[PDB]
Design an enzyme around this catalytic site. Structure first.
Site, short mmCIF file in Angstrom:
data_model
loop_
_atom_site.label_atom_id
_atom_site.label_comp_id
_atom_site.label_asym_id
_atom_site.label_seq_id
_atom_site.Cartn_x
_atom_site.Cartn_y
_atom_site.Cartn_z
N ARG C 97 -1.46 -21.25 -1.62
CA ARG C 97 -2.01 -20.77 -2.92
C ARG C 97 -0.99 -20.15 -3.58
NH1 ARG C 97 -3.87 -16.73 -6.57
NH2 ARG C 97 -1.95 -15.64 -6.20
N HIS C 102 2.59 -19.88 -8.56
CA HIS C 102 3.80 -19.44 -8.89
C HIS C 102 4.79 -19.86 -8.06
CE1 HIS C 102 2.60 -16.21 -6.52
NE2 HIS C 102 1.85 -15.58 -7.26
#
EC number: 3.1.-.-
Lengths: 133, 119, 133, 132
Positions: C97, C102
């Protein structure tokens, strides 16, 4: 008579004179910490001065023993020396000794703008009631 | 001496805040630290004015905290040390799993800053 | 059972269908960035709901509290609520994730295709293991 | 500083990623696949702005963020970004928090409105640190 109340009344006028000067028209105050730090400090000097005057008057006239700083203003109003709406506003200030010794900055900057705009005249009112004599 | 002060700190918020969700005691058991959640954010001045009204009804200073605008670290301090006074339980769990998960993400964002400060 | 657990389980089973609807098979996935985005987000929605489920049981049963997202699974495993392999799989999802949202790493897309082929059952096991409870 | 050069690039790429996906766009509110993409890259722009905000905070010693919104106020506290700009990015962190953590239902009208008249704040933020 006596000296300590006339010096504490004089200081409240000096700090109001300072808050009025440092805060200015209100533009620079919102983005200048030096302007905020002075107004906040001079705001605290008024609260402790009124609490000193309140505790003094309760002492000289034996109105009671104030258990807190707020309870000192209560005895003045309970003996009808100050109006009860005036005591609440001065007790509102008693909880203003916490904007200092806490640099939680933006959370209560709009609040010191509120008390500078709307609540400095509560100190002028309180010292006017003392002036009698 | 307690509780009779608690339901005092219950009547005032329940009567002064529309759509009250929960009420919390936070700091210690002087000095009182109170947190509150509602369906709407609270006005800065109107909250402080109420906080000073709580501080006058009681004897101590009061810090009323708007949980819909408080910082994530402050919200974690409430779910960690705290006592629910009013509100349901499904709203309490909704607010805890929200803050704890948001806090685990914040700790990942600011750990490079925390380490530089702590040498 | 709980009002929050039933809603998170419903969110996971919702996004599992969305992951499986957007993918099947890689006839255009590795060439369509939009399909890649629609799967990664529901992978996050699946991952976050499990983190939300983990943080609840850790608080509701006094065995918390974790300081990281991974420690919530690590904590559910030490107390024999989820299987230690299943615990290590869910934490490695948080890795997938974070790398995807990011990027502190070049997102290897072959891992994402692999997860939707073999690891979607880890969420299905988890919601079943928690529905026991 | 070699990292700020990168995070500006992924902000730029994700903004282009948002624009080409939104299309005109009429199919938007009916196609859930491209809503997911717009939502994802909007989130990427936020977390890429927070990383830039936190690296400057650790390169200057501005404070310790108490929330993701606090990372942009510290830039306005020191007059590095305009106070109305930090308020607009804090409005993005709010949108980003609802997408990541499910503490509300996602209002699509806000997403469409943010796509139309708020993406300029990401351009204006990366246009600062260019680098004053």
């Amino acid at each position: 008579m006596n000296d300590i109340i006339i010096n504490k009344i004089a200081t409240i006028k000096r700090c109001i004179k300072r808050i009025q000067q440092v805060y200015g028209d209100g533009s620079q105050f919102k983005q200048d910490f030096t302007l905020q730090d002075s107004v906040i400090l001079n705001l605290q000097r008024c609260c402790e001065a009124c609490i000193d005057i309140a505790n003094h008057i309760n002492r000289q006239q034996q109105l009671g023993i104030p258990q807190s700083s707020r309870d000192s203003f209560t005895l003045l109003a309970q003996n009808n020396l100050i109006t009860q709406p005036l005591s609440d506003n001065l007790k509102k200030m008693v909880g203003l000794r916490n904007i200092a010794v806490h640099d939680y900055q933006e959370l209560n900057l709009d609040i010191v703008v509120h008390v500078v705009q709307h609540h400095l005249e509560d100190f002028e009112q309180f010292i006017d009631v003392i002036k009698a004599e | 001496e307690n509780k009779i002060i608690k339901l005092l700190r219950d009547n005032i918020p329940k009567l002064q805040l529309i759509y009250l969700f929960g009420s919390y005691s936070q700091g210690t058991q002087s000095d009182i630290d109170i947190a509150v959640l509602a369906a709407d954010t609270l006005d800065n001045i109107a909250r402080w004015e109420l906080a000073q009204k709580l501080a006058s009804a009681l004897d101590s200073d009061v810090d009323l905290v708007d949980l819909r605008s408080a910082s994530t670290v402050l919200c974690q301090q409430v779910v960690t040390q705290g006592k629910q006074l009013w509100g349901t339980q499904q709203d309490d769990e909704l607010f805890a799993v929200k803050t704890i998960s948001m806090y685990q993400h914040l700790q990942a964002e600011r750990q490079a800053i925390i380490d530089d400060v702590m040498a």
